[PDB]
Chains A and B, each alone.
Chain A
Amino acid sequence: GPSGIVPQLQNIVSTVNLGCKLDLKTIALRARNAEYNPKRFAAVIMRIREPRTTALIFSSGKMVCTGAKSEEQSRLAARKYARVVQKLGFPAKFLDFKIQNMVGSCDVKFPIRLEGLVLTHQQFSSYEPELFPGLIYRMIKPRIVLLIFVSGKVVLTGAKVRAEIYEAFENIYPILKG
């Protein structure tokens, strides 16, 4: 059963279609929050604290936002940037909101001997202590990629909802225990 520690989400990734053409130079000229460094990259990157997130905008009318701790928080930040662009003088719309990725982490509070895991799980676990200190495991159900360390803490990514993170956590937990 559960060890009493829940996987806390660390990140959320989401995108929405603004539905109109925008001028990045105009945004950099008007908005009190903007980049335009075309010498490096022709784009504008936002960020707000409530929710704590970073978003990025193009002239093509797409938005990519990331940084929240919950999917609904990410959507709130997305709608905040949509409001900002609407009051920037652009006819922005909050259309086709899609959630792309999230990151979570947890712990088991006992040491992990990676050698046994690689010896019994090499077919899906990649161990290489020379470059990346931890161990890499790719999980199929659901499409999750997992990082495991000796300290017992685990990083989970590749899901679309917190339920997937929890379910993968409890799938791996017996393996971590033994």
Chain B
Amino acid sequence: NKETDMFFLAISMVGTDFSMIGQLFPHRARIEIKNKFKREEKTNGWRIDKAFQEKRPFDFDFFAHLLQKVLAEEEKRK
């Protein structure tokens, strides 16, 4: 669930763009992200539309740290 939320969130920050999220995701390839998008477009189209109208910024720093903290939290809680 968390990974899906973050895939969405990055799709809003880095757009419908996959190689960079694969790069920042420790263990995801671009084909993986493309497949996530195929699977999710059928149901979450409205959220992906929410992904292209707000101008909140993107980073490595604030984000890289946010990724690592939420992944550690999820792994310790899962």
Count class of interface residues, chain A = 10 to 19
Q: Which residues of A approach B to under 8 Å, CB–CB?
A: 28, 31-37, 40, 45-50, 54
Cα separation A48 to B48 with both chains bound (whole Å): 10
Q: Do most interface residues of chain A lie in helix, strand or loop, or is the interface mixed?
A: loop
Partner of A32, one of B45, B49, B55: B55
Across-interface contacts of A45 in B (CB, < 8 A): 17, 19
Count class of interface residues, chain B = 10 to 19
Q: Which residues of B approach A to under 8 Å, CB–CB?
A: 12-20, 23, 45, 48-49, 52, 55, 58
B19 adjacent to A33 (CB under 8 Å): no
A47 adjacent to B49 (CB under 8 Å): no
B13 adjacent to A32 (CB under 8 Å): yes
Cα separation A28 to B23 with both chains bound (whole Å): 13
B20 adjacent to A48 (CB under 8 Å): no
Known: A33-B14, A34-B14. A49 touches B19 (CB 8 A): no
B15 adjacent to A33 (CB under 8 Å): yes
